[PDB]
Design an enzyme around this catalytic site. Structure first.
Site, PDB file in Angstrom:
ATOM      1  N   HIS A   1       0.827  -1.213   0.000  1.00  0.00           N
ATOM      2  CA  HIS A   1       0.000   0.000   0.000  1.00  0.00           C
ATOM      3  C   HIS A   1       0.863   1.266   0.000  1.00  0.00           C
ATOM      4  O   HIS A   1       0.843   2.068   0.941  1.00  0.00           O
ATOM      5  CB  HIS A   1      -1.004  -0.029   1.157  1.00  0.00           C
ATOM      6  CG  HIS A   1      -2.090  -1.046   0.980  1.00  0.00           C
ATOM      7  ND1 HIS A   1      -2.085  -2.263   1.627  1.00  0.00           N
ATOM      8  CD2 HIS A   1      -3.209  -1.032   0.214  1.00  0.00           C
ATOM      9  CE1 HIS A   1      -3.158  -2.952   1.277  1.00  0.00           C
ATOM     10  NE2 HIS A   1      -3.855  -2.230   0.417  1.00  0.00           N
TER      11      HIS A   1
ATOM     12  N   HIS B   1       1.678   1.777  -5.738  1.00  0.00           N
ATOM     13  CA  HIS B   1       0.276   1.381  -5.809  1.00  0.00           C
ATOM     14  C   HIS B   1      -0.626   2.550  -6.181  1.00  0.00           C
ATOM     15  O   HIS B   1      -1.483   2.425  -7.067  1.00  0.00           O
ATOM     16  CB  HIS B   1      -0.149   0.787  -4.462  1.00  0.00           C
ATOM     17  CG  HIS B   1      -1.607   0.468  -4.365  1.00  0.00           C
ATOM     18  ND1 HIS B   1      -2.222  -0.469  -5.168  1.00  0.00           N
ATOM     19  CD2 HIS B   1      -2.567   0.942  -3.537  1.00  0.00           C
ATOM     20  CE1 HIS B   1      -3.501  -0.555  -4.841  1.00  0.00           C
ATOM     21  NE2 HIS B   1      -3.736   0.293  -3.855  1.00  0.00           N
TER      22      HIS B   1
ATOM     23  N   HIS C   1      -5.896   7.779  -2.477  1.00  0.00           N
ATOM     24  CA  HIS C   1      -6.844   6.837  -1.877  1.00  0.00           C
ATOM     25  C   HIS C   1      -6.267   5.941  -0.769  1.00  0.00           C
ATOM     26  O   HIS C   1      -7.020   5.384   0.034  1.00  0.00           O
ATOM     27  CB  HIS C   1      -7.525   5.995  -2.967  1.00  0.00           C
ATOM     28  CG  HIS C   1      -6.813   4.718  -3.277  1.00  0.00           C
ATOM     29  ND1 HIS C   1      -5.733   4.653  -4.133  1.00  0.00           N
ATOM     30  CD2 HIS C   1      -7.018   3.456  -2.833  1.00  0.00           C
ATOM     31  CE1 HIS C   1      -5.305   3.407  -4.201  1.00  0.00           C
ATOM     32  NE2 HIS C   1      -6.070   2.660  -3.425  1.00  0.00           N
ATOM     33  N   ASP C   2      -4.943   5.798  -0.741  1.00  0.00           N
ATOM     34  CA  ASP C   2      -4.261   4.980   0.272  1.00  0.00           C
ATOM     35  C   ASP C   2      -3.258   5.753   1.134  1.00  0.00           C
ATOM     36  O   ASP C   2      -2.347   5.153   1.710  1.00  0.00           O
ATOM     37  CB  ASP C   2      -3.562   3.779  -0.390  1.00  0.00           C
ATOM     38  CG  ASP C   2      -4.386   2.503  -0.307  1.00  0.00           C
ATOM     39  OD1 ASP C   2      -5.106   2.336   0.694  1.00  0.00           O
ATOM     40  OD2 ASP C   2      -4.315   1.674  -1.239  1.00  0.00           O
TER      41      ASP C   2
ATOM     42  N   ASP D   1      -8.515  -0.153  -7.934  1.00  0.00           N
ATOM     43  CA  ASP D   1      -7.820  -0.587  -6.734  1.00  0.00           C
ATOM     44  C   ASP D   1      -7.229  -1.975  -6.915  1.00  0.00           C
ATOM     45  O   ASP D   1      -6.152  -2.270  -6.394  1.00  0.00           O
ATOM     46  CB  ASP D   1      -8.777  -0.580  -5.533  1.00  0.00           C
ATOM     47  CG  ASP D   1      -8.059  -0.381  -4.213  1.00  0.00           C
ATOM     48  OD1 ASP D   1      -8.709  -0.516  -3.160  1.00  0.00           O
ATOM     49  OD2 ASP D   1      -6.849  -0.076  -4.215  1.00  0.00           O
TER      50      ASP D   1
ATOM     51  N   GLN E   1      -6.303 -17.038  -3.875  1.00  0.00           N
ATOM     52  CA  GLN E   1      -6.430 -16.132  -5.017  1.00  0.00           C
ATOM     53  C   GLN E   1      -7.599 -16.554  -5.894  1.00  0.00           C
ATOM     54  O   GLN E   1      -8.429 -15.720  -6.259  1.00  0.00           O
ATOM     55  CB  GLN E   1      -5.125 -16.038  -5.811  1.00  0.00           C
ATOM     56  CG  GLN E   1      -4.030 -15.230  -5.105  1.00  0.00           C
ATOM     57  CD  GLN E   1      -4.384 -13.762  -4.940  1.00  0.00           C
ATOM     58  OE1 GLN E   1      -4.369 -13.000  -5.900  1.00  0.00           O
ATOM     59  NE2 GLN E   1      -4.700 -13.360  -3.714  1.00  0.00           N
TER      60      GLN E   1
HETATM   61  N1  LIG Z   1      -4.802  -9.677  -5.746  1.00  0.00           N
HETATM   62  C1  LIG Z   1      -5.440  -9.424  -4.598  1.00  0.00           C
HETATM   63  N2  LIG Z   1      -5.816 -10.141  -3.615  1.00  0.00           N
HETATM   64  C2  LIG Z   1      -6.456  -9.707  -2.530  1.00  0.00           C
HETATM   65  C3  LIG Z   1      -6.863 -10.408  -1.489  1.00  0.00           C
HETATM   66 CL1  LIG Z   1      -6.582 -12.123  -1.435  1.00  0.00          CL
HETATM   67  C4  LIG Z   1      -7.557  -9.654  -0.405  1.00  0.00           C
HETATM   68  C5  LIG Z   1      -7.784  -8.351  -0.422  1.00  0.00           C
HETATM   69  C6  LIG Z   1      -7.323  -7.552  -1.595  1.00  0.00           C
HETATM   70  C7  LIG Z   1      -6.709  -8.237  -2.545  1.00  0.00           C
HETATM   71  S1  LIG Z   1      -5.930  -7.819  -4.070  1.00  0.00           S
HETATM   72 NI    NI Z   2      -5.672   0.656  -2.639  1.00  0.00          NI
HETATM   73 NI    NI Z   3      -7.243   1.472   0.772  1.00  0.00          NI
END
Ligand SMILES: Nc1nc2c(Cl)cccc2s1
Ligand code: NI
Ligand code: NI
EC number: 3.1.4.17
Length: 328
Positions: free
Chosen positions: A79, A83, A117-118, A228, A280
């Site tokens: 984050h 990003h 946003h982060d 996002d 995933q």
């Molecule tokens: N590729 C990504 N995986 C995730 C998971 Cl597993 C949880 C929360 C956000 C994201 S983005």
């Molecule tokens: Ni984000």
């Molecule tokens: Ni965020």
């Protein structure tokens, strides 16, 4: 508190010019900022200029803003500044394929929102802060981090010569903040599930209408989510590499939950890497696919984002069946 960029930092960016060859690539959905770290700030300026015009903000006020928005991001695995710009680019790509659906004020707000946003992320999730009662969880009861992110944005705006939105009417200044707030809040994945489901129902029943303000907020909502998560829409090798960052951060949070006598969820447990593929797979079917499926229905020029997500879903299925290549 809030950090300020140096005189040397914002001035160096003003001199910046984007290499000719990149102009053609940056327009594509699958473009990957990764190989261009030095350029990222000036990459954003470029996108703002092409989308909102060169006489949108004062260049000095904009460049001061960006380099302070850089400096207020943390050296956390995922984050982070990298990003923020990757989300900004995906928004820029969506906006360029859908330019006239969104007003001049929206496009500038959404690009700023994505970069912001982060802001000031700690690498700790909403779950963490609320499970352990961090002072941020008591001040912000829902969408905890996303509220801190917007509060951080406003704080950067209030810095000396940083306010890019000053040359707007006081009425339009109110509007753009609300657009930004509603955009930043929508990046809370808890809210996504309800948003998508509703948006789907409005589209199927034909009642969806972008001239209805509440509908616009929701579409903007889904767009924010799409941006996002866009790491799942890049080319497989890039997708694979970014996952390593997301989990590197998840695992360091798990490392904190253990000491305080909690077994953290499988996803955050660094001794549970074996589940990562199937995790995933689940995240794609439950969140990613449906997000890009619905967005495409609403904005058909965004279809390449869904093609790329279906592509990466297939590659995670391959990893599960044991067919994985090297990829580093
Ligand atoms: N590729 C990504 N995986 C995730 C998971 Cl597993 C949880 C929360 C956000 C994201 S983005
Ligand atoms: Ni984000
Ligand atoms: Ni965020």
């Amino acid at each position: 508190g809030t950090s300020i960029c140096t005189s040397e930092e914002w001035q160096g960016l003003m001199q910046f010019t984007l290499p000719v060859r990149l102009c053609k690539e940056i327009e594509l959905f699958h473009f990957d900022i990764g190989p261009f770290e030095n350029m990222w700030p000036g990459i954003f300026v470029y996108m703002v200029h092409r989308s909102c015009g060169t006489s949108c903000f004062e260049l000095e006020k904009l460049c001061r803003f960006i380099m302070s928005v850089k400096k207020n991001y943390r050296r956390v695995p995922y984050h982070n500044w990298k990003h923020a710009v990757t989300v900004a680019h995906c928004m820029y790509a969506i906006l360029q394929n859908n330019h006239t659906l969104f007003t001049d004020l929206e496009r500038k707000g959404l690009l700023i929102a994505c970069l912001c946003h982060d802001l000031d992320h700690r690498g700790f999730s909403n779950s963490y802060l609320q499970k352990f009662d961090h002072p941020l969880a008591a001040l912000y009861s829902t969408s905890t981090m996303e509220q801190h992110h917007f509060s951080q944005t406003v704080s950067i705006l209030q810095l000396e010569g940083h306010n890019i939105f000053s040359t707007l009417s006081s009425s339009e200044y109110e509007q753009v903040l609300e657009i930004i707030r509603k955009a930043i809040i929508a990046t809370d994945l808890a809210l996504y599930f309800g948003n998508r489901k509703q948006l789907e129902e409005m589209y199927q029943t034909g009642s969806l209408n972008l001239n209805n303000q509440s509908h616009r907020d929701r579409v903007i909502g889904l767009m924010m989510t799409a941006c996002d998560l866009c790491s799942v829409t890049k080319l497989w090798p890039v997708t694979k590499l970014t996952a390593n960052d997301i989990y590197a951060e998840f695992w360091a949070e798990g490392d904190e939950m253990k000491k305080l006598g909690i077994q953290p969820i499988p996803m955050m447990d660094r001794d549970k890497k074996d589940e990562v593929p199937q995790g995933q797979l689940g995240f794609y079917n439950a969140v990613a696919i449906p997000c890009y499926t619905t967005l495409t229905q609403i904005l058909p020029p965004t279809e390449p984002l869904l093609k790329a997500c279906r592509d990466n879903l297939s590659q995670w299925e391959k990893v599960i069946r044991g067919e994985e290549t090297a990829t580093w």
